[PDB]
Amino acid sequence: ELELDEQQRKRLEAFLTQKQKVGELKDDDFEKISELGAGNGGVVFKVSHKPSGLVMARKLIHLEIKPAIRNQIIRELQVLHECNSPYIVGFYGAFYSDGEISICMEHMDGGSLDQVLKKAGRIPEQILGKVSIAVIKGLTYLREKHKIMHRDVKPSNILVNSRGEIKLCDFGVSGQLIDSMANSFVGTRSYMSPERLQGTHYSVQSDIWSMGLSLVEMAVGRYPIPPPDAKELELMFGCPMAIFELLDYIVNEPPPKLPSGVFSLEFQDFVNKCLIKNPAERADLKQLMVHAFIKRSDAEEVDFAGWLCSTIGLN
Ligand SMILES: COC(=O)c1c[nH]c2ncccc12
Ligand code: NA
């Protein structure tokens, strides 16, 4: 499940070789091209690293903290130089400058799945199969090689590109950057598992809930809680709640589900196994990797890049 084919081995080797040419990252070496997002307490820009000529994505986190603090964060973000996977966004480096931490990463031309969703309206089942594989393999990589979980799976944290690659970004790597960002805002809690919202027992099972929740949103074209009325489905397939009320609904109500007679039973089953409220009964990475929907999605050779380019008008 963590074994790479020839094309993925080659792409990973070409990225590291290219990264080795980049030295110490410095503020003045960057030229802004455009803006990309802001979903996790910062701002993302498409930038040009002037000396190397490489196009990167630069996350700027505005924090006003004593020299001692920032230096620890930066040492802790060095963990990311070890995160080498076709399912994790490439990391170039991190530094502090004029009151802000910069995280420099690989630029994904397809953007994030929240953006792809907005354009598309809804994402087809076969495309969601490819997304599911990448999320499971990404979470398996994080857990296997670095003994860490994502903690923030959601559509905006899944990045796509014109080469048909799907990658995860924005996973807790620096304990200090987390602690120094307390009282929030570090991102919405609307994708959190019932167990995390109860302050109870939390593992990679919480990430599986988030994935399951994100898949239903992308398949239907709407954030799924509260479930849609019989009339809202007739609009969609022919065939407002305040955050505190919403978080209560997740803990207290039955989990969302895909509408029937629209999606395959294998896909409906797969999301249901991710969305079981009790994390013990809920499926795990090993179980998900051999699920009928995953095996069928793997054997399906889906032109993800072709679908992507047509949908967002890339080219
Ligand atoms: C937090 O990381 C990001 O948002 C991104 C990292 N690379 C990207 N490429 C395009 C859009 C967003 C990003
Ligand atoms: Na993000």
Can you offer a commentary on this structure?
The chain has helices at residues 6-20, 67-77, 113-120, 125-146, 175-179, 194-197, 205-220, 230-237, 243-252, 265-274, 285-289, 292-299, 304-312, and strands at 30-37, 43-49, 54-62, 91-97, 100-106, 111-112, 158-160, 166-168. The protein has 315 residues and is α+β, with helices and mostly antiparallel strands. The protein is built from 13 helices and eight strands. It is globular and about 55 Å long. It has two domains: 1-109, Phosphorylase Kinase, domain 1; 110-315, Orthogonal Bundle (Transferase(Phosphotransferase), domain 1), CATH 1.10.510. β2 (43-49) and β3 form a beta hairpin. The strands form two sheets. It has a five-stranded antiparallel β-sheet, with helices on one face. Helices cover 42% and strands 15% of the residues. The structure holds 1H-pyrrolo[2,3-B]pyridine-3-carboxylic acid and sodium ion. 1H-pyrrolo[2,3-B]pyridine-3-carboxylic acid binds at residues 36-37, 44, 57, 59, 89, 105-108, 111-112, 159, 169-170.
